[PDB]
Design a protein around this ligand. Structure first.
Ligand code: NA
Ligand code: NI
Ligand code: NI
Lengths: 139, 139
């Protein structure tokens, strides 16, 4: 028995990141874990607790104010009810919008540290995913 | 209602990545999405279907066989029953072991493209998460 627990990203300004993931994406702070002896702080955020959800781990390294992104790591994707409305709320709050489709299926937005977040209409994505599994013999 | 759906990483060689995540980590291939005209392939893997699980998405760009890594993106963490037993099994198959504690709580291994994976004893992790949440007043 195995489970995906979380994805970790490093952030330059911990409070700014927390504000984005909570106020703009509707996550809740689950817990924090400061390790001053090794000069870092962890915070876990998600839509439910780690015991029943896969969550986001932020790492702040003392004195490291910003990060450069490679061409390797992609993104996290979040399933939502209304992509158009959520994107509208992001723009209202000056979040960069990298991509927005016409139909409201998909968008990409940029977090305060420059990471990409994919927003998906959960209902449409799941219908598609199940359909493709059934076509490919995995469901 | 919102949910973390997946994390995406780009990989140099689908065959070797799929071998690692299935044979070494116990995930299953859920579905593929191949777009020859746009020169890419996506593969979704996980411990359960996208409908009930947060999964891993691999993107292969045709003819791109290596990715260099930033120190921004962290890792994905996977909860297991026996870290030591796994790490052993991994070391048998020449998987790089970056870190392994004495207690059996935590280890870090490296996937074929150089991404880090955190292996955690899930029981212990969740006990700790629960106690931290209660102490911090978020539970
Ligand atoms: Na920055
Ligand atoms: Ni994606
Ligand atoms: Ni972690």
């Amino acid at each position: 028995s195995r489970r995906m627990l979380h994805t970790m990203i490093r952030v330059g300004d911990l409070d700014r990141s927390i504000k984005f993931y909570t106020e703009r994406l509707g996550m809740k702070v689950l817990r924090k874990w400061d390790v001053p002896e090794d000069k870092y702080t962890l915070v876990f955020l998600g839509y439910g607790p780690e015991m029943s959800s896969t969550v986001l781990e932020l790492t702040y390294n003392y004195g490291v104010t910003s990060y450069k992104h490679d061409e390797a790591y992609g993104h996290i994707a979040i399933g939502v009810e209304d992509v158009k409305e959520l994107v509208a709320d992001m723009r209202k709050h000056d979040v960069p919008i990298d991509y927005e489709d016409e139909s409201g299926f998909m968008a990409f937005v940029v977090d305060p540290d420059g990471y990409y977040i994919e927003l998906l209409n959960e209902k449409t994505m799941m219908e598609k995913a199940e359909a493709d599994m059934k076509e490919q013999g995995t469901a």
